[model samples]
Target: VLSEGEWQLVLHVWAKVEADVAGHGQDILIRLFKSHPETLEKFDRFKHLKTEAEMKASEDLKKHGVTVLTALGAILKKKGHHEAELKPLAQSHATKHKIPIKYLEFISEAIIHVLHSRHPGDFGADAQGAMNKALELFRKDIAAKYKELGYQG
Candidate 1:
């Protein structure tokens, strides 16, 4: 769980880019797919995209990216208490979407990288550290949910 000050830093930095969810979300997704190409194959909506330009121009990718980032925002708003936001997501990914848990970590990596790259001055070590801690907590809750739903890996 994030401390009060840590949560504040994360929420403050998150607010800076919340309005442009799709833009930031797309960047994060592209980074994720770049780093983990196999993960892209898991996405029926995005697997056919052959080039970076295609990915960038993909409206479905943008919409799905927004969903990913929106879920992050919703989890953060709960201050590391993720049940309400993550339960449905975990169930869907486990039974319906069948997404692997490792991809979740990849998304967090892209999220931190993108935020720091976009606003180096504002999203410094302090903010980054706080965000990392918060996401770590979020991931644990998600893992627990996945386990409960009988999802392996």
Candidate 2:
């Protein structure tokens, strides 16, 4: 549901994000975990970590962070036509991973916060709104997938 101008703004910040998806992904996770430690407890690898420094240093965290952003990058490549990537992700999170759908919202906010911190000049209010809209669409898509799969949540 993005207008042309909104799409343009999304692309503008996304271009910079492409350069360091792994780094940015890790940063987003750190932000998510810091504010929502309960979410961090959901990760088997990250569940033991107690400090930001430890999280920053963990290779497993880095790898998983890359996995998170790699999926996001693929979804963006399709301009949010992300069924190929998000379908299995939704199922995994719903059944196997048992992740609460609400975590996606936390991740979205983390992404926006990270982007704003990294590109203050480019991430104006318009750009932030565009990103928020895009992420909202993605989250709704996942939520729909969960319902289709008969996930009780």
Candidate 3:
């Protein structure tokens, strides 16, 4: 289990990913590739990109890819940007899988576990502190969006 601070940090990193991918196209693709290189093989635009030029040629695909990834990221992070794009799908998935809202908490926990396990060499003593700061800001923004939509939780 993460301390309260560490939990907050995980949320913060998620929020940063959402914010960075919001409107910027190429940057979002670059970030996605950087953060999850293994998944790049699934994207045709990245399949043949041995050099930067080949990757650059797929700018159009990148734009759409980023939009989709960013939208999905926002939903997972609970940041609430145009939730219509993903919420219905999420609801269907949850229903099909018989997942409850408690699963959200689990998802959050899993993020921390993955980060710690995969990046043990990267997270130093101050990592949790930095994450807390980011999470606080993200939570505030998400709360506001929910409020605007008349969402109770």
Candidate 4:
């Protein structure tokens, strides 16, 4: 169940970030790779970067990044719908990709980074908190599939 207030936060922040798919997505993945470098191990194509720039620079990376953020856009759009919205991706990620649930933390962190860092005044603490709740709502749903795979990820 999505709260009207949190949905507003998600909608507001998303409106700003949605304009630049590659840049925004790459920025998120870069931040993710920075704070949780170990998570990069899952992406063999991006794992050997000397700097996060390498990941942003590669055509492969650009292609992959665009794909991910676009999918996230779908999930964000459906926040008002059932929590099971991205269930197939969640299950496939856990069972096939073996991406642990812990790594999912980067999604909200990177997104929040983009929001406050990119547009300071618009997304204040109240907005940030609401967005965090929205992101956590997503994480909880995905985490169920992670646990189903017998991995806490």
Model 4 stretches with alpha carbons more than 4 Å out: 80-85
Model 3, 12-65: lDDT tens digits are 555544564533445444444545555456556556655445555676656775
Q: What TM-score fits each model?
A: 0.93, 0.92, 0.35, 0.88
In candidate 3, position 26 carries an lDDT of 52
Q: What is candidate 2's lDDT per residue for 1-153, written digit by digit as tens?
A: 788788788888888877987788779889999999999878886799999999889888878888878777778667766778887888789999888778888888888889878887867998889889988988888889888888736
Clashing residue pairs found in predicted model 2: none
- The reply for model 3, stretches above 4 Å from the true place, is 1-4, 22-41, 45-48, 78-153
lDDT-wise, the better of 1 and 3 is 1
* Global lDDT of model 4: 0.77
User: Is candidate 2 or 4 superior in TM-score?
Assistant: 2
**Clash-forming residue pairs, model 3:** 9-131
Ranking by TM-score: 1, 2, 4, 3
List the candidate 1 regions with Cα displacement exceeding 4 Å.
Answer: none
Question: CA shift at 88, candidate 3, in angstroms?
Answer: 9.6
Where does model 2 exceed 4 Å of error? Answer: none
Worst 10 residues of 4 by lDDT: 79-88
Candidate 1 local lDDT, residue 141: 79
lDDT of 4 by residue, 1-153 (tens): 667877887788777777887877777778888888788888777777868657767777767888987777788788746456577887678888888777788767878887677786877787788778877878887887677778757
